[PDB]
Amino acid sequence: ATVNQLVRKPRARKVAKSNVPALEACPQKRGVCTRVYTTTPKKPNSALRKVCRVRLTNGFEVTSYIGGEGHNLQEHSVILIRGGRVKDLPGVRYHTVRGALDCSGVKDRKQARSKYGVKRPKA
Amino acid sequence: ARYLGPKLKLSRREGTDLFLKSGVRAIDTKCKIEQAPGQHGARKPRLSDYGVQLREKQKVRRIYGVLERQFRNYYKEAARLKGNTGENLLALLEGRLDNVVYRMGFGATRAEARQLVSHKAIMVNGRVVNIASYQVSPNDVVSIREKAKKQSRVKAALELAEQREKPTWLEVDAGKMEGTFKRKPERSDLSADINEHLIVELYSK
Amino acid sequence: ELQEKLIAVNRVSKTVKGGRIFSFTALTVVGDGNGRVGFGYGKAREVPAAIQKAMEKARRNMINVALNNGTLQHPVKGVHTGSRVFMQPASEGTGIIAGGAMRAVLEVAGVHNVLAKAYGSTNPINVVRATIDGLENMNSPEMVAAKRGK
Amino acid sequence: SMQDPIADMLTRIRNGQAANKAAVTMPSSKLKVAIANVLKEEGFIEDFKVEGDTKPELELTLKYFQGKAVVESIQRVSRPGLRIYKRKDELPKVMAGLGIAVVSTSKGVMTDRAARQAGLGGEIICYVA
Amino acid sequence: KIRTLQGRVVSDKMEKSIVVAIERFVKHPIYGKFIKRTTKLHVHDENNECGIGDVVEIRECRPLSKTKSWTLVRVVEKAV
RNA sequence: UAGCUAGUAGGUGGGGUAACGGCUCACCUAGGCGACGAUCCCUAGCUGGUCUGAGAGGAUGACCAGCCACACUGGAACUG
């Protein structure tokens, strides 16, 4: 672009699109939770995986992933969400926290046992 | 932090005796040193240059006992005033009080000297110093206090040093257990005049 | 004797009717350690026979460049087929700096270190050609000297 | 183009070296003549002459010395689209000091060597090596 | 005197004043090209003889009205 | 985002303060700002500095030094 154009009026970046604006640029955000259900990934990666519908503290609802084995999550339980990129499971850019609020940890972790808010081995 | 646990694994990874359990158990080895770090190395060899660079990053600092943050903090003073970082870093690591107390013969290792420095036994410029993060000035005095001179471990450290060669950049009177540090050594006088092409590119990016 | 350096070697897949067949291809440089250099490329079966083919073509594409005690005095630009490279004199700080073709080409030529960056097409077999074009973009050895007197 | 009298001199020399010619002739001006006199002084030409009947033509004899080429660089710096001015301590140093920069100055067209020794700045016209 | 300038009249709709246009004469701070850049002054004039498109000489003073800190010195060129 | 401005832009008579000024009251004019961006919306206190990067240009103005503005909210007064 010419100097005679930029000296008359400058030109603007376009645009670097945002991934997860529903998290308000926070490291974590809270939500109330409604229904918890099973969903299926793209067929080359075939499996079953679990998600929940989470209305946040703000105006937005998201489909959040549930990692780790154990189903006991309930409606209006109030839980924490983190932005976490899933590219083989439909409409999921969001992960649930197990180690905080009305969630449970995972039993018998042989390796990587600090995940899901799981404490030192005693059981 | 510092390392704790089994010691022969350390001398096995360094391929060299560390003076750890090195009495009659050092004679003609039979201890996996110079042979077998880990247990594998001959069947699926990757020979990665990132792995030799990672090995050099351990190798260069463990000899002085200094941790990564300490080593990069000395490298910050070697990388200013132009490059030649391997020779300019040498003068800093060799100027440490744990290294100087080891070269004066009061410890069989730099860690044994560092543990004599912590035990309030060492004095510099006429006053007591208990940190190894100190740097000794040229033609200044380093000495040991009376209540440590007869300790069987220190007796055995000076007994080891008098069976070896002398460093010329300091002097000590064994009739007083006291003397002066003359200068920070030179990398080509401490060993030989050679280029080591990894240490001049070490750390960052 | 001409001194050798390997820049890269890798396995290469080819999907043919009913199956895949594998080859190796090597990227090499050969030089005299004073000012003469060439770059090689070649495909074969197994690493050492691909390197053998590449080193044999490095010894067929050579150029001879005169430099005053092996230095690159001024900022200098290399070009080949949309691959671009630019080299700059240092300040005796970190100094070296730069990797791959922009490290290896000057090593087998015995040439003193520079600060270097690539632009455009980054594919190594054309960036190396731009590096030996930038070596030829350097001035006469030694020229001023007698062009302009003190 | 009538909009620039310096491109009318520099590019004639680069195209003349690309054509490997011994001499080059151009339409004249006091500035082209002042630059030709310093290109003779700095060893790039061996002669300059101004000849004509109704308008002046400036003919330069190029000084190649001992092999190919008379310039490794002939680069334009200040232009009608963008002016380039430097103080005495912000003067350029062309190709690690192998080249020269041409400076306007209130005292007449000179080298960066001469401007630095005088203690002056001005417009940077071109780089020559 | 502290500041004294020359410029061109653009409004004469006032009985003790005029509006004068002046140039900045400035290098653009990042794009490096030179620009004229026209800025306006509201200037004191109790004679009321200088007029639109004429060239005037003006001097800086203490405030005489709101947005009025300059006064007329001379008519430099007459545009008819 | 194309219009926005009746104390707005300018004159002519009278007042107020430690002083400037449409600060303020009255009688008259149609000016002024705006594509070099007025109107309007979201965002944001200012500088020394901090600080990413090859650098440009941004970002960022918690700490220490100096300004602005607020004192639940709005609007006044008394005193120096």
Add this chain to the structure above:
RNA sequence: ACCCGCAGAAGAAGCACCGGCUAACUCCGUGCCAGCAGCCGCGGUAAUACGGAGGGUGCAAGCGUUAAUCGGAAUUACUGGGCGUAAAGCGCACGCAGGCGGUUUGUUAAGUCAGAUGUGAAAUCCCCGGGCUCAACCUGGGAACUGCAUCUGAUACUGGC
């Protein structure tokens, strides 16, 4: 603060990572499931990629998992782009704020450049000295804040006359 003692190893080590990028190895189980995941990609009968393993690597009072603000990003392009065909030359001519302008002499010093007098507080990067057990910290000094002002000066070229 500092000095000398009284007890006992006593009061003390985590956490990811190990197919490739990326340093650490490849046994058995599962059989596109159960799971893994930053990226490439992995998982149907020995899976170097999951589970389960024993061993192995690296940081360390930290380790993993993220966010803010930048970098890589030339991805808004001054430094530093793209338009025959990979985005875009606008169907053609007329007029126009702005951008550029022959060849010379004389004048001006607005652009520019030179030298002085100021201001850019103290702190601070950089650079040179000193003391705290070292550094941080406490600081003696020199740089720098490329500028913005007030004089004096050159006068080549752009602007103006």
Add this chain to the structure above:
RNA sequence: ACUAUGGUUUUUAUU
């Protein structure tokens, strides 16, 4: 050039 004409075949280990 040398007769004017003739439509469909599930996504799929996957090299």
